Subunit: 291 residues, 6 copies
């Protein structure tokens, strides 16, 4: 990494300058999940990159999922699930496990990783200081909308308290659980929650770490892969895409139409993907803008 | 509760005035555990009382344990323990479970209970914003000091950041886990941690909720029960007391000699015990002062 | 007062919690007069209660009258009065005496009483820092409106400066005298002034200490005594009531229609009446709301 | 006043500049009494001059006496006095009258006069916000120190709260009454109180308005009149001077040795004497400095 | 200057009080040029007067020209000029000289003069912190508008940053040079720039130091000289006046119609002219108001 | 610059992280001179790099020289010099030219260049707000110390005001001229001034842009070139080095012994040299530390 001449090291850094200018003093929300969360080297790079942002006076906010870890814990506890369509029903018991895994295990790991660089990270959920509330959602299955227990969407966000938290120099690491209007805690899909936090905080950018190069319109044609797309076009394309690309794309839409200047689908399998997408013009991600 | 004449309701409230004066703008640390934590009616009273303090401009800080809940979860997970003396060894696996139970389950319940009264509670551990660190402890068993894994005492406390957190109008609910100097998270005995937080924050009072009327010098003589005692006297008495009274008493000593004006052993089985001990002269607790 | 079991002392305090929540950080204006001002034990309770409010982070503002004390001083000075209808004419000489008695005697007593609990009280009049101005009033007598000298109503209030004064942690004790637009000081009826200060400061509650159990619609039927009433109903009832109840009722109307959520007519002859009315559901007072 | 050429009007103003520089942002304490207080034209000039100071960003503090007005009121009330030596005994009754006259009459007049120029003046006594306390004094008479009732010297001053009051842009007008350690209000000699306030607030200058051209060492030799003198010299001269010059001179000593850079005895019978002494080199006063 | 009695020194100062009140905490923009800039005694008086304003808590802002000094320097450098009509073309070379003379010579002299009284003055141009921008102007010559190089009018002003600069206690000394939208620095006529700064900063007054007694409507009739005039009247009169009076009059118009309460044409040949015009009713200047 | 794979672009940026952490919120003083100042491409890179620092929340301060430009201007003006030893005597006339060239020409260019990236740069000299003073220096020539006119060293620095200037988000661009204790402006060697500003402001680093690869102990042996050296060693080596390396080395000594953690001699002929030296381990410069 040093057989590389130092006059070229210089230009790489200098080309970061226009993005440092654009993001300085701005909040960036990052949905962190997938492989970028399960592999040790990529995890540490992700944390080091949150430290980078904070040491540039940029204000990152991290929203994390953790579907597979909840499943494993429920299996470890011998808790048998009920399934409507493809969805597990979130009984009170399943929520307790979810909350405990998301907040007490997955969030802790990232807080400690980030904090290796300084006292930056702080874990929270909608429960803490009533930072955000949830409204119960229903999913549509094989035709008909259906109840699947204590699952919801972000309802309201204490935009004010959240931004004080970051002006204090903090990186919030959010576990997507929040109570409803009656104090009953729901679990929120982490992709949609990221989009709701981005819009509530006036984020400059929403980053969505996923396990793919970027959005393919005609998957799997190699050259159907697109670099940038507007919301109107992407909305017309949404009904066609793979099962798992929908949440990451629905999020990018609801954020960008909500006023977030751009959402980005970037490849979480690339070390320092966020540095690459934010401070470099050579990213593999897909950028969503309003249109 | 209203067959009681209203001229007597008045005097009860008026007699709270000298303690409102003394605690106004002061931090009070409360170790919350025992039955006050397992019974539904007593839990809700405890939360309502934290709301009371905060709505008097007093600054409560809650430190909670949860020994029995960790044990149950380890049994649920089929994780076999190792025991030196009376102590379970805290392997990395046991810590993960502990952390997840203390922070992801027990702390959450109190945060939501308190927050029924407003956006006050916020959960944290030494991991968040590096608020406090731990140093590995060893226990003495049948003669010889011995290692029992990832267990420690509070090392350093970010006194500054902690008090900003409460000046913002927050009730911190602390789960006693913190990392050491190398980022390795330890579990800390909640009683000792409360005493360390009280001393670090310049608390005016340290409250220790336990499952007993108060300190008995000659248990179980009914009239060996004492109302107030100095540290020097209590230190000479410590080697004699029941197995479980030691941590609550060691804490009261280390706090009061650390400069905390008084520590109190109060009966967590009494509804609104903290209201009674703080704003009334008719408490059953034991008050420890320096001597 | 201690033959009363301590589990009942607890519940009295706990039932204060919803009113502590509602008044926290709010201004409460209190018109103080009548017997609550002439009896030593009731005076000290009143002061101790202002200290209570301030030590709950509530912001009391006291407005006081003192009709009988002015009369006595004028008699002591051999100053013969002129009377149109039932009203003494407020010559420049009578105003000087009034101002000197209200501000230099009656207000001083309450400032010192309150200040026994801390550096809270501060005496003022509309003259100080131009906090409020007066406009000359005329009274109606046996048919025709008539001039009775330097008597007026509150004109304008420096809402801003007044609230800075209380955010500093102060209890203003107001003597109802203020200058007009030309610097000519008038004496203002203390009941009406309280209502004007309450409305100007966005008070949460207006308390009116009087010498009666509460409002009687058909005095003196014992069960004509009412617990709560709306402004529209009370306005239709106002033309019927005793000579002295009019000012306290006109005040409650003009405050509540001015946007103050409730005004209260409470019995100043009850020790700690304000504690009882504010933090207890067992008050004898009458609550006025908008309707 | 305009037959005077405008190039000379200019130089008068320009010669004020070095004293504007020296006093900018500084507190000046002014003892106001004597004729400067009893004549209408001189009163209005005095008030206009306090407005001048405040509109130069100088921070005046006014301390006033009023001996003759108390005497007249006591005579009006038929309150017979007791006299040890030359001193009236200050019974509780005499204090009430004093307090009421000083605070409720004399202070009010100056507050309104000053306030004709803006919302500047605010009246206070040691009672308000516990701004200062008194300690009972005894006088020496024909040889032996003797008690003369509720008379004292300034004990402690809340320097902090006082300076916040002036940073808010206020002119405090102080009536020299304060409570002792037990809440018992004493009357304080206004000259000595001014000296104590000057020293407590780190005043830059202490002004003493009196009814004389200045200090005469050999009164009444016309040319014994001095322009400046040091404390050591003036202390040796103090035992010789007229009965009434002692308090004004004792004050100047205790202030200047207390660290106040200069005290000044200026002629209150000169219109705008304070403008002349502060912003002009042609004053008749006497300046006391440390030596 | 002291054969003048001190009771008259007093009244001169006291008559300043209503203008101290009106200007306290207000910004006053002063165009400084002409003889008031070339004569040593008048220069020092001008600086001492800026110190005066600042030590009254008034916020002066100085805008300076310097036409003749640029001309001399260009002649010293042997830089031959081109002239369309009466105007020199401002080539890039002429701008560099102008900028260097205005900012590096003329502004420095005033900064040091003022700073003899304290750390007040600070020199700037539109280039510093992008405080203001310029738009290229064209002049009209013998009929047709024509380009004369890098000369412009003030375009936009960072009103916010400018007022922070003065709230810090600073006297900005502005050299009228600023960049356009593309970073190309233009030279701005100092009279027009003063008018633009006055309007942008919400100045209370605009002072224009010139080399004349005041505005003459029928120059040179001695009694055509006017004391005050409205914008509508002065606009109808503008097409008639001497060649050099136009810029000072156009400025006063554009300021006063821009909302500045008054602009003043005052005689820079009078020592302390600004003291005379601001704090005295005996000025020779001409006051422009809206009409 | 893009035939370079994007996984390597990532690592270049990530390796900046430990230096972003170390410099975040810290002041870095940069002496800017030599070729880095005369070539267009290197100038723009230097400005872009100051923008970089400011957009990382680092606080750069620029100190510039300009010896050759003064010489050229004096020649353009036909001002004949006097020379003692190798030094031109700085007559009042030469200072005026120097001041005008340094502040009115050289500083302006950098302010505008930097400001192309935002409203960051602000030009100043010790004259502005009395930010720093000078003391007259004498040089030693062929044996004997000798006067060479208005040349000096930095005397005192208003550390406070300077750091407020940068906390406002500003890049000060300093022209090394300041007045002495009597207001007489001197010209200060820019290298020594940088060292004095670095020490006064508690700079974290002092950067010295020069026209050489780095310090050579045995110039011109190619491998006498050193990467790091302590002050004690460098002090013993100073008497041997080339004529022009002395000021840059004396500066690095006086800074580092003054408590600045490191001074750096870096090659101003390298594009983005400051990015390379600050955020990369591959710099050609020489680092001076205390020893
Ligand atoms: C949300 C909040 O206030 C917070 C927290 O939840 C944890 C640590 C520090 C903090 O300031
Ligand atoms: C109204 C005010 O400012 C004040 C006062 O009138 C008396 C004592 C302290 C104060 O702050
Ligand atoms: C405009 C500014 O910020 C400034 C300056 O240009 C010079 C000295 C101090 C300052 O605050």
């Amino acid at each position: 990494i040093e057989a590389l001449p130092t006059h070229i090291k210089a230009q790489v850094l200098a080309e970061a300058l226009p993005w440092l200018k654009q993001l300085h003093g701005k909040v960036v929300v990052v949905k962190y999940g997938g492989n970028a969360m399960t592999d040790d080297t990529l995890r540490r790079a992700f944390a080091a990159d949150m430290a980078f942002l904070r040491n540039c006076g940029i204000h990152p906010v991290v929203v994390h999922g953790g579907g597979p870890q909840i499943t494993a814990m429920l299996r470890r506890l011998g808790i048998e699930g009920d399934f409507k369509g493809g969805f597990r029903v979130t009984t009170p018991e399943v929520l307790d496990v979810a909350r405990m895994v998301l907040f007490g295990q997955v969030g802790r790991e990232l807080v400690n990783l980030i904090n290796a660089h300084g006292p930056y990270a702080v874990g929270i959920t909608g429960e803490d200081a009533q930072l955000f509330t949830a409204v119960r959602r229903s999913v549509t299955v094989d035709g008909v909308a259906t109840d699947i227990g204590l699952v919801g969407d972000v309802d309201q966000v204490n935009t004010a308290a959240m931004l004080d938290l970051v002006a204090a120099g903090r990186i919030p690491v959010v576990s997507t659980l929040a109570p409803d209007a009656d104090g009953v805690v729901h679990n929120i899909n982490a992709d949609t929650a990221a989009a709701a936090v981005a819009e509530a905080l006036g984020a400059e950018k929403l980053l969505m770490l996923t396990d793919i190069d970027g959005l393919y319109t005609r998957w799997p044609d190699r050259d159907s892969l697109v670099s940038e797309i507007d919301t109107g076009t992407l909305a017309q394309l949404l009904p066609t895409l793979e099962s798992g690309m929908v949440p990451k794309v629905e999020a990018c839409l609801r954020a960008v139409i909500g006023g977030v200047p751009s959402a980005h689908i970037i490849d979480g399998r690339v070390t320092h993907c966020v540095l690459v997408e934010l401070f470099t013009d050579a990213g593999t991600g897909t950028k969503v803008v309003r249109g």
